[PDB]
Amino acid sequence: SKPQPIAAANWSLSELIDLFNSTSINHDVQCVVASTFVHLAMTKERLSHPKFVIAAQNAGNADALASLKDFGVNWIVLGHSERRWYYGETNEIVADKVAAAVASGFMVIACIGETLQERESGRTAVVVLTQIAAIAKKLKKADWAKVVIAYEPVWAIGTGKVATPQQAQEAHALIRSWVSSKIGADVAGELRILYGGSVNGKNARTLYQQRDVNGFLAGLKPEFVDIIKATQ
């Protein structure tokens, strides 16, 4: 059966926090609010729901990680689409950031995913696996307990074009199969692989039914409540 699912929101911020705080969540699911540096302190001050944790984003400096831990931040998102396609973080830069975060005692949501052209030319597999192999090269087996994979087709991020359940399931399954082969079937079976890209209230439920979907990464928005509820 599936490991504990995760619903993660990538960042009015005060009214959203109010709404989350008042939300009862009956089933088992880890919720994550990933905030940019400038809004971290306020989020931690305001968000008191114990099923939620706060996540930093993109920190790559040794002292920065240290300071985040000091402040009570234990989760971090790394490798998100724009980091790669705009900021210029390579597979190896992302992988180094992930190993550093794990060494500093972070839970890590590592993002991978293919471009529109890669998808169209049928190169989704080679691309996403090259990306995860770079990450895995800097980790030891035991590290995976601290790792979560977020699969996000670049063409589905903020475009309104969601992956179909078939597309998501196929991607998730090829990722899990590679992890099974290269890392261990034990690690594979416990690994959370999340889907992201145009997830909403209407489509999340159907996506979660898929065998290899363990939750979602989505925007910080009022409908995030329904995405959380769709993780069953």
Ligand SMILES: CCCS(=O)(=O)CCC(=O)O
């Ligand atoms: C405008 C963002 C829509 S979204 O759901 O595709 C965001 C996904 C993500 O930030 O990972």
